[PDB]
C-alpha cells in the first residue's frame, strides 16, 4: 500500500534505498527493448519487400503475399511501444540515481547524532552560536529532505510506469 | 489552568482544527506510516480524546484548546526553547494579543495560555525548565564568541578546562563560577527568536542562553559588533536583566522588539 | 506447397525465425527486472515493468505464430 513519508525518519528512508542491486537491472532492459524495437522495425521492411521474391509470373495465387502484408502494421505499432518501454525503463533508472544522490547518507545521519551528544556534554562558551539548535535544525532538514525525495521518487517512477 | 497530552494526541488535533504542521522544535511527527493504518488511529485517537473531555461528542474540539494549537502551528513571533539537563525538554513560546506556550518532555506536550503583561512575566517560563537556582554574583566580562566556540571545541576533543579558561580576558572572581558549569549538576537553554511577517519566516543568527549551575544562575547575552561579528557578555542571572537581554535578540529581527 | 511461392514461403519462415531469435534473446531480461533498492517505490515499479514485460512477451508470441499461419490456402 501507499505509505506516508513523514512518519518515518530519514534513517529508514536512506537505509532501504542505499542498499540494493542498483539501477543496472533497468538499463539492462532498456537496451533490450531498444534492441527489440530495432528488430520489430527491421522485419517490417523485409515484410513490405516480400514481393519480388515471386519471380517472373507474379500472375494466380497472389492472395499469399496479400495476407502476410497486413501484419506490417502490427510490426510498426510493436516497434513503437517497445522503444517507449525502453524510455520508461531508462527514465526510472535516472529517477533512482538522482534520488539516491539526493538522499542524506546513513553516515551523515550518523555523524549528526554524535555531534548532538557532545554538545550536551560541554557547551558553555560557544552557547550563543546556538549549536544545539542548528544541529537539530540540520536533522529536521535531513528529515524533510528524505521525505521529499521519496515523495518525488514515487511520482517520477509512478509516471514512468504509466502506459496508456 | 491548562492541559497536557502526548505527541500522537497533539497531531490528531491538527487534522480537525486544520492548523497544519507544528514547529519542528517540538518534533511532533505523524504517528502512523500508512493510510492503511489511518482509520485505526482516526478511531483510536478520537476515542482517547473524549476520555479527557477536550473532544466533544463526535468531532468538536474544545475552543479554549483549539485556539492554543492554531497559535502554535502558525504563530507571528515565537521563541524556540531547548533545555538541557542530565533527558532533554523543549518547547516554544508563540504569540498571535494572546500568547500560548508549549513544552514537550520527549513524550508529553503541555500547552498553556499566558499574557503580554510585562517584560518580567517571561522569566518564569524561561527559568522553569532549569533547576531554579538563585542568581550568582561575579565580575562581568565579554569575550568574542566565534573564538569562544573554538574553546569548547577543544574541551570536547580532549582538553583540560583550567588551563584554557585563563587564556582569555578572564577575571579572577569569575573563574570559580565558569568552572562549575562544566560539571554534572548543571542545566542550560538556548533561546532563538523568530518572526513570520513575509512569504517566509526567519530566526536569529544567534541566541540568548541562561545557565543554572551550582554557583548560581548566569546570563549570557550576545550583541552585534561593528564588523558584523558577535560578542557575548557573561553577567549575573538577574530576572530583570534577562528581560532586556531578550528584546535585544528580538531587535535583530525585521519586526523589531515586541514592546518597550 | 505451390510452384512459384516456394521463394515466398522460405522468406516468411526467415522472418518468423528472425523475430523469435531476437524475441527470446531479450525475453528473459525484460520480464526479470529487479528493483534497484528495497524501498516500496522501486518494488512497485519493478513489478510493473515485469508485468507489462510478460504480457508483451506473450501477445507478440501469438502474433508471430499468427503471422506464420497466414499462408493457409
Swiss-Prot record, chain A:
- Location in the cell: Cell membrane
Q: What does this protein do?
A: Important for the siderophore-mediated iron-acquisition function of ESX-3.
From the Swiss-Prot or TrEMBL record, give the protein name: PPE family protein PPE4
What happens without the gene?
Answer: PE5-PPE4 double mutant exhibits a severe iron phenotype but secretes EsxG and EsxH normally. Mildly attenuated in vivo.
Q: What else is known?
A: Was identified as a high-confidence drug target.
In the record, the note on similarity to other proteins reads: Belongs to the mycobacterial PPE family.
Q: What is the lineage of its organism?
A: Bacteria, Bacillati, Actinomycetota, Actinomycetes, Mycobacteriales
The stretch of the full-length protein covered here is 2 to 168 of 513
Swiss-Prot record, chain C:
UniProt subcellular location: Secreted; Cell envelope; Cell surface
Member of which family? Belongs to the mycobacterial PE family.
Residues represented out of the complete protein: 6 to 78 of 102
* Chief location bin: secreted
Task: Please give the function described in this protein's UniProt entry.
Answer: Important for the siderophore-mediated iron-acquisition function of ESX-3. May play a pivotal role in the evasion of host immune response by M.tuberculosis. Mediates production of IL-10 via activation of the p38 and ERK1/2 mitogen-activated protein kinase (MAPK) signaling pathways.
Q: Which residues form the PE domain?
A: 1-73
* N-terminal signal peptide: none
This chain belongs to the protein called PE family immunomodulator PE5
Q: Which GO terms describe its cellular component?
A: cell envelope; cell surface; extracellular region
Q: Which domain of life is it from?
A: Bacteria
Keyword set, alphabetical order: Secreted, Virulence
Question: Null-mutant phenotype, please?
Answer: PE5-PPE4 double mutant exhibits a severe iron phenotype but secretes EsxG and EsxH normally. Mildly attenuated in vivo.
Q: Does the keyword Secreted apply?
A: yes
**UniProt KW Cell wall biogenesis/degradation keyword:** no
Q: What is the lineage of its organism?
A: Bacteria, Bacillati, Actinomycetota, Actinomycetes, Mycobacteriales
Amino acid at each position: 500500500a501507499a505509505p506516508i513519508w513523514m512518519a518515518s525518519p530519514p534513517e529508514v528512508h536512506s537505509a532501504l534505498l542505499s542498499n540494493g542491486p542498483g539501477p543496472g537491472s533497468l538499463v539492462a532492459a532498456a537496451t533490450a527493448w531498444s534492441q527489440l524495437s530495432a528488430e520489430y522495425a527491421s522485419t517490417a521492411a523485409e515484410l513490405s519487400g516480400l514481393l519480388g521474391a515471386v519471380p517472373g509470373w507474379a500472375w494466380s495465387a497472389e492472395w499469399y503475399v496479400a495476407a502476410h502484408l497486413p501484419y506490417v502494421a502490427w510490426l510498426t505499432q510493436a516497434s513503437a511501444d517497445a522503444a517507449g518501454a525502453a524510455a520508461q525503463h531508462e527514465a526510472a533508472a535516472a529517477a533512482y540515481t538522482t534520488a539516491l544522490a539526493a538522499m542524506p547518507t546513513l553516515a551523515e545521519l550518523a555523524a549528526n547524532h554524535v555531534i548532538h551528544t557532545v554538545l550536551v556534554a560541554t557547551n558553555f562558551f560557544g552557547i550563543n552560536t546556538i549549536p544545539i539548535t542548528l544541529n537539530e535544525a540540520d536533522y529536521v532538514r535531513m528529515w524533510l529532505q528524505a521525505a521529499a525525495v521519496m515523495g518525488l521518487y514515487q511520482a517520477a517512477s509512478g509516471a514512468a510506469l504509466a502506459s496508456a | 489552568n491548562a492541559v497536557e497530552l502526548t505527541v500522537e494526541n497533539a497531531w490528531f488535533i491538527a487534522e480537525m482544527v486544520g492548523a497544519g504542521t507544528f514547529p519542528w522544535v517540538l518534533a511532533i511527527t505523524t504517528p502512523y506510516s500508512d493510510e492503511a493504518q489511518r482509520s485505526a488511529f482516526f478511531a483510536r485517537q478520537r476515542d482517547e480524546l473524549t476520555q479527557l473531555g477536550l473532544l466533544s461528542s463526535d468531532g468538536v474540539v474544545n475552543p479554549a484548546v483549539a485556539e492554543w494549537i492554531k497559535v502554535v502551528c502558525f504563530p507571528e513571533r515565537w521563541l524556540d526553547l531547548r533545555y538541557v539537563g542530565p533527558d532533554l525538554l523543549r518547547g516554544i513560546v508563540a504569540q498571535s494579543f494572546n500568547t500560548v506556550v508549549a513544552l514537550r518532555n520527549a513524550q508529553l506536550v503541555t500547552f498553556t495560555a499566558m499574557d503580554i503583561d510585562d517584560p518580567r512575566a517571561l522569566v518564569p517560563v524561561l527559568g522553569v525548565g532549569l533547576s531554579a537556582r538563585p542568581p550568582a554574583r561575579f565580575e562581568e566580562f565579554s569575550m568574542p564568541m566565534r573564538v569562544g566556540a573554538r574553546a569548547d571545541e577543544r574541551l570536547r576533543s580532549g582538553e583540560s578546562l583550567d588551563e584554557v579558561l585563563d587564556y582569555l580576558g578572564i577575571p579572577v572572581s569569575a573563574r570559580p563560577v565558569v568552572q562549575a558549569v562544566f560539571s554534572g549538576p548543571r542545566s542550560y537553554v538556548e533561546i532563538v527568536a523568530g518572526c513570520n511577517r513575509d512569504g517566509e519566516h526567519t530566526t536569529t543568527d544567534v541566541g540568548l542562553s541562561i545557565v543554572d549551575t551550582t554557583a548560581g544562575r548566569v546570563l549570557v547575552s550576545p550583541s552585534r559588533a561593528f564588523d558584523g561579528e558577535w560578542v557575548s557578555t557573561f553577567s549575573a542571572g538577574t530576572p530583570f536583566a534577562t528581560a532586556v537581554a531578550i528584546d535585544q535578540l528580538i531587535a535583530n529581527l525585521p519586526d523589531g522588539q515586541w514592546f518597550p | 506447397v505451390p510452384e512459384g511461392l516456394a521463394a515466398a514461403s522460405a522468406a516468411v519462415e526467415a522472418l518468423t525465425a528472425r523475430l523469435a531469435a531476437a524475441h527470446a534473446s531479450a525475453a528473459p531480461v525484460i520480464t526479470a527486472v529487479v528493483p534497484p533498492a528495497a524501498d516500496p517505490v522501486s518494488l512497485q515499479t519493478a513489478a510493473g515493468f515485469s508485468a507489462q514485460g510478460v504480457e508483451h512477451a506473450v501477445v507478440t508470441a501469438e502474433g508471430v505464430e499468427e503471422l506464420g499461419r497466414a499462408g493457409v490456402g
